[PDB]
Amino acid sequence: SERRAVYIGALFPMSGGWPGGQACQPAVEMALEDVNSRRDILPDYELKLIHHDSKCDPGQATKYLYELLYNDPIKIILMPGCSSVSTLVAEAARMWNLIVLSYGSSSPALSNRQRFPTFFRTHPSATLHNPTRVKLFEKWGWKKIATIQQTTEVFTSTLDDLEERVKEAGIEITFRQSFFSDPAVPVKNLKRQDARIIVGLFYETEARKVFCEVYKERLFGKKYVWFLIGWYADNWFKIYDPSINCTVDEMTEAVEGHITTEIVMLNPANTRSISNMTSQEFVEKLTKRLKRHPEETGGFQEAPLAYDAIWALALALNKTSRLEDFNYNNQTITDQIYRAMNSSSFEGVSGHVVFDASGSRMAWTLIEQLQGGSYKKIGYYDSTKDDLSWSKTDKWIGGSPPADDYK
Amino acid sequence: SPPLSIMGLMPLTKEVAKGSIGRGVLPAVELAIEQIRNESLLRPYFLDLRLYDTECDNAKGLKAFYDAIKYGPNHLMVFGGVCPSVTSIIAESLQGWNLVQLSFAATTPVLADKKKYPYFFRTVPSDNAVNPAILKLLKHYQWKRVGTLTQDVQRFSEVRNDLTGVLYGEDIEISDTESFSNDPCTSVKKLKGNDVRIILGQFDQNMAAKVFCCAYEENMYGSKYQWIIPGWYEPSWWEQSRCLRKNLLAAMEGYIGVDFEPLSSKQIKTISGKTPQQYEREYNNKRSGVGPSKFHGYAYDGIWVIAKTLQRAMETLHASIQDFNYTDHTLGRIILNAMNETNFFGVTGQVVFRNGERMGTIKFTQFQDSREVKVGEYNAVADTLEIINDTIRFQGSEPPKDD
């Protein structure tokens, strides 16, 4: 007769490196209202939220993790956002037999089952770009690839994964260059080695420095293809930076024709998901709940993943159905939710939700090309089904893509 | 007699390898505590050190810290943190509970970042503290050109990265920078090819035997060469594939080892009334069957840093403790300012901090036929070097030239 309250301990980054909690906390709150109003999901239970602002800071998150674990009520799951916060809470979690479900962490290192044995994420790993990269090389028949990276853990781990994945496809990494803050030497070294197909992994500030150096060494043109990450701001190369010698037009010239990969976070299709919403309705509903405009709201694009994280948990808890008896000293309930979480398969606002063996999200990637200083959608790739959605909108100088070597 | 509770954090279990640091330092801690108590230095109060085992593990370490806050007494500060990843986690969160931390064994340079770790202090010099000592050694012998050989592991690359800033604006050129992961021979051949004579090495004990085998094969040893490498390896580390033991020893001959000084060599009375030598005898008696630890003097001086800090803190409150809960920002700030004033002569030499970092003593050693022998010491406070007159030796008529 009485619905028993079951609690999620969540951490939301309202500020810091990725202030994703700005749109992910209302997306989570919306999903809890939607799950609780559905009588076919958890009829005997009411999913409640206890949350704190991590400020995308592990030090700050350490204080709130304590507050979550050492204060009643007992929480059945932890929900962090930032990778630095998830690395702390996902490693600590085994001491309280707690499942950890992140809505925003991209760090490849979180796919380690030894360090993070109860971790899942609706946000994919940064390594999800690599199967799309190998498939693009296979499509345009390239077996010799160069790699330039900024010295950061994520880019190092992503390239380490790119190495084992190219070997599987009979493709080899010719040259690997790295920089801390100033490129110039790796860019100079790329012209030196006559590298043609180049995968560049860096943040937006460093991307500008890279492409200004690309200009001077004339590393752009018909001879080369640059493979970059697709989550920089619109017109990132046009952005004014006092530390760049090159101009707007110079940068616009250096960036022409480069390819980008990015994770599909909102289903492009007009279909209805498990909530019975469309992608466009989710967006409209979320915008109403926000104090500021979507463009001024941190984590707006990731918000569907936070919404879907709640549904993945609700469906998992639904599959298990003795939730009030959960204790930090016991593994029995944890192991059952682990099993249910592992076997997730449903349609969310971000598309089809499935985790791999590491508990990392499997999703579509959007492939884009910079055509005339603007990005055009040239395709989509589904790693699990080896399905490439190709639109005949890709364009190259001389009507065709170049080759990897001398020819 | 009200308590002044301190949260002791360290690996203590026999099952955990670094449990030997925590157990090896406890007799030193017991000696300092016992003295301070007899002398009623903290009268009316008494020092209440509570011990919690981190097990040298991130998850267990964090749970030990959390359990100490939940079920333990109201601790005024943290004493310890031995393992680098556990200490980084606790150190970064300190401000959340207004807890000042004093470590005696965490040497990772990362902890010097006062933006990330503002409430963290340490009595032990960090892995980077050898770099100002090496600069003085180079200046002493007129070595203006050096080569570097570094293992591609964070522990070593941190040290090499700091060397850049230490040698900037000094008349010392790093003519060749070489890195390696598993086999140093390629890099050793590049050093030879670039005619490097003075090599600053940063690599583990296992890689050192490989480095010296490559040095024998490339003839990078004898009167024309000086290897300056870590001084923290275990004794007989070389004894423990292509080279012969006699050939390894011939290439190892004369290498300079650099590490922090475990205890002061000055026969002067310290804050406790005992000379470092008298303290060392008292520690060796008290330890019984427990294996000694090179951090024992750092742990002993650490207790004295806490007692002297609490004294200054008690004076500051009297110039205007029980009510302190992790809530009191002002008391944590008083404790933080009090610790920053630390200035006494301890068993490890003069105990002073520079932005939470220990200004201490660096020991120089030289491999002479069968073992490392002390050849000198660098005093970081004074920025001075003292070479032991008739110990350090060279195979030629003069020390080597740098080109």
Ligand SMILES: *[C@@H]1O[C@H](CO[C@@H]2O[C@@H](C)[C@@H](O)[C@@H](O)[C@@H]2O)[C@@H](O[C@@H]2O[C@H](CO)[C@@H](O[C@H]3O[C@H](CO[C@H]4O[C@H](CO)[C@@H](O)[C@H](O)[C@@H]4O)[C@@H](O)[C@H](O[C@H]4O[C@H](CO)[C@@H](O)[C@H](O)[C@@H]4O)[C@@H]3O)[C@H](O)[C@H]2NC(C)=O)[C@H](O)[C@H]1NC(C)=O
């Ligand atoms: C998943 O999605 C849609 C959601 O619909 C809309 O979207 C939300 C975001 C909100 O804005 C909602 O307010 C909004 O409805 C659901 O589809 C609708 O749901 C019902 C399903 O039956 C439909 O409602 C009426 O359906 C019939 C006849 O509809 C006729 O008229 C429309 C145009 O007005 C035509 O397009 C249709 O082809 C058709 O000719 C009607 O008989 C029902 O009316 C009542 O009849 C009885 C009379 O005795 C009453 O006693 C009852 O109250 C009964 O309801 C419905 O009013 C509605 O048209 C569809 N709309 C669409 C676009 O398909 C969908 O069902 C939902 N799935 C769930 C909840 O699982």
Ligand SMILES: *[C@@H]1O[C@H](CO[C@@H]2O[C@@H](C)[C@@H](O)[C@@H](O)[C@@H]2O)[C@@H](O[C@@H]2O[C@H](CO)[C@@H](O[C@H]3O[C@H](CO)[C@@H](O)[C@H](O)[C@@H]3O)[C@H](O)[C@H]2NC(C)=O)[C@H](O)[C@H]1NC(C)=O
């Ligand atoms: C944290 O400690 C810093 C160092 O303090 C000094 O060393 C301790 C071991 C102890 O002996 C303490 O009493 C010493 O002051 C503090 O920085 C120092 O601040 C001093 C000013 O209070 C400054 O000194 C000045 O003294 C005269 C002034 O005309 C001059 O002779 C001298 O040139 C200085 O200007 C001293 O330089 C400065 N130290 C350094 C290395 O910068 C710091 O303020 C303190 N903070 C606290 C307690 O909150």
Ligand SMILES: C[C@H](NC[C@H](O)CP(=O)(O)CC1CCCCC1)c1ccc(Cl)c(Cl)c1
């Ligand atoms: C797609 C991705 N989503 C969130 C990301 O996984 C959070 P993260 O994994 O914690 C990495 C952040 C932290 C530092 C600054 C930006 C990246 C992302 C990546 C880079 C940027 Cl700039 C944004 Cl806004 C979003």
Ligand SMILES: *[C@@H]1O[C@H](CO)[C@@H](O)[C@H](O)[C@H]1NC(C)=O
């Ligand atoms: C929730 O679990 C029940 C129990 O079997 C099931 O009938 C129901 O369909 C599940 N809900 C969803 C939407 O899968």
